[PDB]
Design an enzyme around this catalytic site. Structure first.
Site, mmCIF file in Angstrom:
data_model
loop_
_atom_site.group_PDB
_atom_site.id
_atom_site.type_symbol
_atom_site.label_atom_id
_atom_site.label_comp_id
_atom_site.label_asym_id
_atom_site.label_seq_id
_atom_site.Cartn_x
_atom_site.Cartn_y
_atom_site.Cartn_z
ATOM 1 N NE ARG A 163 -3.470 -1.943 2.993
ATOM 2 C CZ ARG A 163 -4.720 -2.346 3.174
ATOM 3 N NH1 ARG A 163 -5.720 -1.649 2.666
ATOM 4 N NH2 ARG A 163 -4.969 -3.446 3.863
HETATM 5 N N1 LIG Z 1 -7.196 1.799 -9.207
HETATM 6 C C1 LIG Z 1 -6.076 1.223 -8.707
HETATM 7 N N2 LIG Z 1 -4.923 1.207 -9.411
HETATM 8 C C2 LIG Z 1 -3.806 0.637 -8.924
HETATM 9 N N3 LIG Z 1 -3.733 0.042 -7.722
HETATM 10 C C3 LIG Z 1 -4.814 -0.012 -6.910
HETATM 11 C C4 LIG Z 1 -6.075 0.587 -7.369
HETATM 12 N N4 LIG Z 1 -6.974 0.394 -6.387
HETATM 13 C C5 LIG Z 1 -6.343 -0.271 -5.386
HETATM 14 N N5 LIG Z 1 -5.059 -0.515 -5.699
HETATM 15 C C6 LIG Z 1 -4.077 -1.219 -4.841
HETATM 16 O O1 LIG Z 1 -4.710 -2.283 -4.128
HETATM 17 C C7 LIG Z 1 -4.293 -2.292 -2.761
HETATM 18 C C8 LIG Z 1 -5.489 -2.501 -1.843
HETATM 19 O O2 LIG Z 1 -6.412 -1.437 -2.063
HETATM 20 P P1 LIG Z 1 -6.897 -0.500 -0.848
HETATM 21 O O3 LIG Z 1 -8.232 0.093 -1.219
HETATM 22 O O4 LIG Z 1 -5.753 0.410 -0.476
HETATM 23 O O5 LIG Z 1 -7.113 -1.550 0.356
HETATM 24 P P2 LIG Z 1 -8.531 -2.277 0.592
HETATM 25 O O6 LIG Z 1 -8.809 -2.986 -0.711
HETATM 26 O O7 LIG Z 1 -8.268 -3.207 1.753
HETATM 27 O O8 LIG Z 1 -9.483 -1.147 0.904
HETATM 28 C C9 LIG Z 1 -3.610 -0.963 -2.480
HETATM 29 O O9 LIG Z 1 -2.318 -1.177 -1.906
HETATM 30 C C10 LIG Z 1 -3.508 -0.253 -3.815
HETATM 31 O O10 LIG Z 1 -2.153 0.077 -4.130
HETATM 32 MG MG LIG Z 2 -10.062 -3.407 2.845
#
Ligand SMILES: Nc1ncnc2c1ncn2[C@@H]1O[C@H](COP(=O)(O)OP(=O)(O)O)[C@@H](O)[C@H]1O
Ligand SMILES: [Mg+2]
Ligand SMILES: Nc1ncnc2c1ncn2[C@@H]1O[C@H](COP(=O)(O)OP(=O)(O)OP(=O)(O)O)[C@@H](O)[C@H]1O
Ligand SMILES: [Mg+2]
Lengths: 463, 48, 489, 463, 129, 129
Positions: C352
């Site tokens: 992340r």
């Molecule tokens: N649109 C996107 N493009 C690139 N990477 C993404 C995108 N959305 C999420 N990610 C990656 O997926 C990982 C998990 O998403 P995140 O929303 O941060 O956690 P969660 O899914 O637990 O809410 C993150 O570390 C992020 O870098």
């Molecule tokens: Mg989550």
């Protein structure tokens, strides 16, 4: 001191005591006027101790008297036990008179500390020629034996029992957790037949016994093996001991049956609340101290052919090697029938054994895998179609399988075979030579039933 | 005819892979069902 | 009277006491025989306690006393190079450890306004986890995979490769056979790492209380450097076994069961622990140390390990943990048995933090490798059923194969920042297109060699500065050409 | 009026009282000894009240004393809270001095009556291809995002904040419940550097706090938004409001954690007996009545990655637009991972959006369902056997699945590629052209992470 | 020779008579001890030795080896073997004979499945011919 | 004609109000008297005879018969029509109309599954043409 029986519900018995002294956990109790001993499993207060009896409980009643030994289940151990058969409490059952050792040791003891561990991981040599090259054992390690009856499971046990005493000067202990009475008698007579019974000790607990008896049997064999390892000869070199368990699965099953009887919130797929704790307390005392070492051969049975079940998952975290016996090899007439492609060992890494041994094992496994993939096409299609190179793979695999079979020291009654104990160096030398390609003109029949590569050279020169 | 043999052999291998995956899912579901039934039985027996 | 109590019930390690009127939550209790216990539940007429020791020596009617101080562990810089039990008692027989201060075990993380964004990188020596899944001081990462797949190997490689970098280290082992712990200590002492490491051990024979409590003591010992401007790195060897011990000690309390017979509060148990690995601002350090040190920021990295059955990441506890950490490294047994080592899955593994926590040159170079790998994997899985493939699909498949072969390494073989930079630059530009796949790994080795003997000044500049400018790019391109031009693999 | 603590277990404290002064339900009490605020959750006769403690429970013994405020947890409302950070109880935590306002509102009140509901009809355009095309939104409605750990829920919530709140005239309230702290600090600083802080109120209760604080932290943000809605300019018109809830699953998970200690019987999969009523008494207050309009966006967590769990099953009917995130599409590298099927919105009908919009969406969903159904025979048999039309459907479905991908503004750091924005008519034109059959010859590798039909033409030429 | 009509029905009545007495429930409500219940009955079928007979009868009869055989019966719901009682009884005994329903209605009588029916004793229990 | 928007929500509310009353749970935690709850409600939909109408109104209305049809609603979890509540309701009602997600997504609206939907009354209810 002077207790009372308060509540008989099946095996579970509640015993009341004086306020000042309430026997501690695991302290064995004796019931006056009857053959039965009680083992404390939980304290409830008001002096009440909730315990489990050993043996059937018909004929008992509320109001009896019970005395306290103030000690766990002490078993008699020494050199006298070898060749005998004893109960869970160490009582003789083969009608051969009392044992001649007065040394009583408890079966409930703490595991060795961190500073008592060895300073090295060492190998145990048994000279089976298939259990040393592809699946190396380690002193202190643990082996899981996969297979049922019909593939000569007891023959390998006889061979190992003889070899440990012949080469490394050690004694063995056999404990049977929930074994069938008929096959137990068959085993005892079979071992008395091969003149191997006087190097081993035996402890039996059968299916008809209350689950308390089946659960605390393995600890008796453990204590006896401990005493065999501990005693020191001049120079104090100690001794290397073996311990056999018929099926640890029945050990866990007896554990979960005992948990319900005492009553407990089940967990997972019905297993007990504390499942690994029991596995650890059993399997953390099979270790290699600076004085000696204990190895363990335990047979395992996977329920419903599902390795994700909690019991195989918990027991698989302690197994250092796995041996698998396939009925196909037995039908092919090769003994011992140990599969050279489905047996695992954590000691087969370049760090421990070295470089050339690791390369040899991996090369033979690769060739056998290629032959396994090739036999299907050679069956559906014709042998000639295949390439000359793969044919060579076929011939080398055939010679390798033939060489993997050897005579035993306990079959000389049946066929007059003298018996072999091949040192590992000869095995590695022969396999390296075979993989090189120097044994390309020798016919395959020269490899069957031979202990060493010279025997093969002599046998091949003879005919 | 030479194509049909390899076609059916590949089909058999794919069927083996699929049955392995289905067996995994089946084991997971069976364990979950046993756990749920035992939990329900214990909870009900606590009520009475 | 108000501080002295008796034992009423002993059952499977849980003791229910009486009296002890002025008894508080979490406070330790001392039993007769130098054995300690922790209060868990208060009630209208009794106190529940878990014994941290060997409860087989305790029986009804014995006495107990309430110390008045919360459970705490000795802490200081003297704990470096020692091995201790959960409460901090040495076991390796090297003699007592002098400890200047004792810290509490139950604590809450600093608030929102007392934190900072992670920008300082951490190096492990593995090419894949650096470029593909970068990490940084203050960021929590999780190593997850099937049994006997290489998890503890990766966690020890970081501790080894952190030498030369002023980073302390703590290693907590839960539910391990004593042979493995002894072997790990031997391996640490061989390479000199134990000079700056601490080890906390709780084996498979130890009770449920110690196995449940140990990671908290590890975190408290690792917080000492973070709260003073220095850094630290802590590695929990198996969180799943801690969860199992908690499940056992809760089912022994008759607490309601749940998914997989796990209690309701199995998310709090992991969140309260894993959210102590934080980077604090200079204001927090100045206020905590009373101006003793200024202009310095603390940090604390965590690398917990968790294990899955049959390789599923859809279970209850694994998904509970995944949602807490800032990433995950998924190790797949299918590739581990196939020879791809370390076997890492690009589809599931993420981080992340992203590009903040790495060097400038690595940031500019390692861009979008992970997504390309995941798309390649899916496409390759699709090509089995496909009869005809166009040119673009062929190129993507070949590139994915080369990249997959490149990202392979052995144990105890660290790589410098410059090494990864050169390798990734060579990969991206397509100089490996004409190279045969089977030789790629060997080819890689040769490259580094040809960049150590010559072009050596650049190597030092990249290793120290970590800077990218049209000069660095030109020099690296010229070096790569020479190697392929005049050398053998 | 002074009570004594009787029992402390976990986060649940039950406290006695005098007979005539027992505090009512949902009132707040203060411990004189330390900083702790207790909330009443149930009455148990004999003047005994069960309570949940807001804060730490370490260092609290039995016999501690407590006073009663005789009023629920009141929080300060008004314009003073603009651009500040507050605790669950309203205390500031930004170290920027006290909040200057005497206007206090309680956080426990009844839901709006049926007579004063309002109809929401004005559309709202985000800029994301899949949301504005298949699951359209409307001002004053309710939106929800469903996914499992690691799939993309937050990176989408922040992108929506970027594309909507930053360019909107009106206030905003952001409440974080049961989420990471690092994200909170990052959001606060990111808003500070953009000079848009003075339009946002913030509340944060994160995973590091005892369940008492995580259980009643959404109601505080709710009360702040409620005041910002009903407030009217003097001789002037009101303004729009926005609400963001980071994770509402933790609100129910806290109750599940503390349910059994309150004395309630377990139900279904370990959940509390009173679940839906507990969800409704909060989800009904997020309303856009005849006075003002509140546009809320929530992210919902899917335990164990299945939508059949009771917690994400009860909440499906409380939202107007639902967007479901899929882990398989994420593992495929397609971002954002939004499932075209199982994603619906109550504003997709020919009257509200038109005819062409409806036809395009319906054709897209039909094609994707056809391909998903076809997958099985492909899995078993192969590709050549299907009809040519089915091969065309396969290729079109692949291209459609890729074209839904799009780079984001707040995700430059992860991938190093700049953000993009697409107008709605461009989405419609691109999908119409794709389904027409004019973009068949373009390789399917050019449809990945590019926004607008034209950029795709350029990328296809670039290859 | 002893033939138990259906033990599956013994188990059902054991479960009922136990649940009525408030013994701890488990998988399928079965009590704590079921495997013990079946083993205690199926471990009485054996072949004692001549010395046992002579000791029991105080020498009245000698040279004759006594024997009790056993052939218990178990019925399955929808042809499964993975339930609790079927697994217990399969583990206890020394072999099994499987009678199918597909074979029974197809006119093949008796419906014995030779593929998965085994006996451990085998060749030692047949006459020479 | 009476329509119930969702007796499932009603079953859940009954479960809550009963579990809060300390009544023994069962399959899926639903206490007893669950079958009664829906049976006594769905049994009141019937057609009476003109004699009943005449007797009830004391001759005010003659030569007419009353009726009350019902169309209740129940929802399923991914097609699990074998849960506790849908089986009870399916056993009480004369007919069953099944709506399929894989049909709704395919554009077939209304998504009625013809091979699982039956009506007992049948042609008698329809007109001649
Ligand atoms: N649109 C996107 N493009 C690139 N990477 C993404 C995108 N959305 C999420 N990610 C990656 O997926 C990982 C998990 O998403 P995140 O929303 O941060 O956690 P969660 O899914 O637990 O809410 C993150 O570390 C992020 O870098
Ligand atoms: Mg989550
Ligand atoms: N580069 C490599 N090449 C070959 N083998 C490797 C490499 N890296 C790791 N391994 C193997 O992976 C193993 C790492 O141990 P692993 O983590 O699999 O044990 P575990 O039982 O799964 O977990 P734990 O170590 O916590 O007990 C080592 O035994 C080592 O042989
Ligand atoms: Mg391991």
């Amino acid at each position: 001191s002077s207790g009372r029986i308060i509540q008989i519900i099946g095996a579970v018995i509640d015993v009341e005591f004086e306020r000042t002294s309430v026997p501690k956990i695991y302290d064995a109790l004796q019931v006056d006027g009857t053959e039965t001993t009680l083992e404390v499993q939980q304290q409830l207060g008001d002096g009440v101790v909730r315990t489990i009896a050993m043996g059937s409980t018909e004929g008992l009643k509320r109001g009896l008297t019970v005395t306290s030994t103030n000690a766990p289940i002490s078993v008699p151990v020494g050199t006298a036990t070898l060749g005998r058969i004893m109960d869970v409490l160490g009582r003789p059952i083969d009608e051969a008179g009392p044992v001649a050792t007065e040394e009583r040791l408890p079966i409930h003891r703490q595991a060795p500390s961190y500073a008592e561990q060895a300073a090295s991981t060492d190998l145990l040599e048994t000279g089976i020629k298939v259990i040393d090259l592809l699946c190396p054992f380690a002193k202190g390690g643990k082996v899981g034996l996969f297979g049922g009856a019909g593939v000569g499971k007891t023959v390998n046990m006889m061979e190992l029992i003889n070899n440990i005493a012949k080469a490394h000067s050690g004694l063995s202990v056999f404990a049977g957790v929930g074994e069938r009475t008929r096959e137990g008698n068959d085993f005892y007579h079979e071992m008395k037949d091969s003149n191997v019974l006087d190097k081993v000790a035996m402890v039996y607990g059968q299916m008809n016994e209350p689950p308390g008896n089946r659960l605390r049997v393995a600890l008796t064999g453990l204590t006896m093996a401990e005493y065999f390892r501990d005693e020191k000869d001049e120079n104090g070199k100690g001794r290397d001991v073996l311990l056999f368990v018929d099926n640890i699965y029945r050990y866990t099953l007896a554990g979960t049956e005992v948990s319900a009887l005492l009553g407990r919130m089940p967990s997972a797929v019905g297993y007990q609340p504390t499942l690994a704790e029991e596995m650890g307390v059993l399997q953390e005392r099979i270790t290699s101290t600076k004085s000696g070492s204990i190895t363990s051969i335990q047979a395992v049975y996977v329920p419903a052919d599902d390795l994700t079940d909690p019991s195989p998952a918990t027991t698989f975290a302690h197994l250092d090697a796995t041996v698998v016996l396939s009925r196909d090899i037995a039908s092919s007439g090769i003994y011992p029938a140990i599969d050279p492609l489905d047996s695992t060992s954590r000691q087969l890494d370049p760090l421990v054994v070295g470089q050339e041994h690791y390369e040899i094992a991996r090369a033979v496994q690769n060739v056998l895998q290629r032959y396994k993939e090739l036999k299907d096409i050679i069956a559906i299609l014709g042998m000639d179609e295949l390439a000359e190179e793969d044919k060579l793979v076929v011939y080398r695999a055939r010679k390798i399988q033939r060489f993997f079979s050897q005579p035993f020291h306990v079959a000389e009654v049946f066929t007059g075979a003298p018996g072999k104990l091949v040192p590992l160096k000869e095995t590695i030398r022969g396999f390296k030579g075979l993989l090189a390609g120097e044994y390309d003109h020798i016919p395959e029949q020269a490899f069957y039933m031979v202990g060493g590569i010279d025997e093969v050279i002599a046998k091949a020169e003879k005919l | 005819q030479s194509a049909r043999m390899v076609a059916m052999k590949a089909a058999t291998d794919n069927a083996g892979q699929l049955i392995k995956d289905l067996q995994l899912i089946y084991n997971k579901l069976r364990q979950a069902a046993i756990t749920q039934e035992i939990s329900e039985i214990v909870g009900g027996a606590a009520a009475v | 009277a108000k501080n002295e109590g008796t034992i009423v019930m002993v059952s499977d390690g849980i003791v229910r006491i009486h009296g002890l009127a002025d008894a508080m939550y979490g406070e330790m209790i001392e039993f007769d025989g130098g054995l300690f216990g922790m209060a868990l539940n208060l009630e209208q007429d009794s106190v529940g306690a878990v014994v941290l020791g060997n409860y087989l020596s305790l029986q009804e009617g014995q006495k107990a006393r309430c110390t008045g101080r919360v459970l705490e562990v000795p802490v200081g810089p003297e704990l470096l190079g020692r091995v201790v039990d959960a409460l901090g008692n040495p076991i390796d027989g090297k003699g007592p450890i002098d400890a200047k201060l004792t810290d509490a075990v139950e604590k809450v993380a600093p608030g929102v306004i007392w934190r900072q964004s992670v920008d300082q990188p951490v190096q492990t020596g593995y090419k894949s986890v650096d470029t593909m899944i970068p990490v940084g001081r203050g960021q929590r990462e999780l190593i997850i995979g099937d049994r006997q797949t290489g998890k503890t190997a990766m966690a020890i490689d970081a501790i080894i490769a952190q030498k030369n970098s002023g980073i302390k280290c703590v290693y907590v082992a839960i539910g391990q056979k004593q042979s493995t712990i002894a072997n790990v200590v031997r391996k640490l002492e061989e390479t000199g790492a134990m000079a700056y490491t601490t080890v906390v051990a709780a084996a498979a024979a130890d009770p449920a209380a110690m196995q449940y409590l140990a990671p908290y003591s590890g975190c408290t010992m690792g917080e000492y450097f973070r709260d003073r401007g220095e850094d630290a790195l802590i590695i929990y060897d198996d969180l799943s076994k801690q969860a199992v011990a908690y499940r056992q000690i809760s089912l022994l309390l008759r607490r309601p069961p749940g998914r997989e017979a796990y209690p309701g509060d199995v998310f709090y148990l992991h969140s309260r622990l894993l959210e102590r690995a934080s980077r604090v601002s200079a204001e927090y350090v100045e206020k905590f140390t009373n101006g003793a040190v200024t202009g310095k920021t603390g940090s604390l990295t965590a690398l917990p390990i968790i294990e899955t059955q049959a390789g599923d990441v859809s279970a209850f506890v694994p998904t509970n943990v995944i949602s807490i950490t800032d990433g995950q490294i998924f190790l797949e047994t299918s590739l581990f048995n196939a020879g791809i080592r370390p076997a890492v899955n690009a589809g599931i593994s993420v981080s992340r933090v992203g590009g903040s926590a790495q060097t400038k040159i690595i940031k500019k170079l390692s861009g979008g490798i992970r997504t390309a790998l995941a798309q390649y994997r899916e496409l390759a899985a699709f090509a089995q059923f496909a009869s005809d493939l166009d040119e673009a699909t062929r190129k993507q498949l070949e590139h994915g194969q080369r990249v997959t072969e490149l990202m392979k390494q052995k144990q105890y073989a660290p790589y410098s920042i410059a090494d990864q930079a050169v390798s990734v630059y060579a990969s991206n530009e397509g100089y490996m297109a004409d190279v045969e796949v089977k030789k790629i790994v060997d080819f890689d080795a040769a490259l580094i060699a040809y960049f150590r003997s010559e072009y050596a000044p650049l190597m030092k500049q990249i290793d120290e500065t970590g800077d990218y400018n049209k000069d660095i790019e030109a020099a690296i391109k010229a070096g790569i050409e020479s190697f392929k031009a005049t050398q053998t693999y």
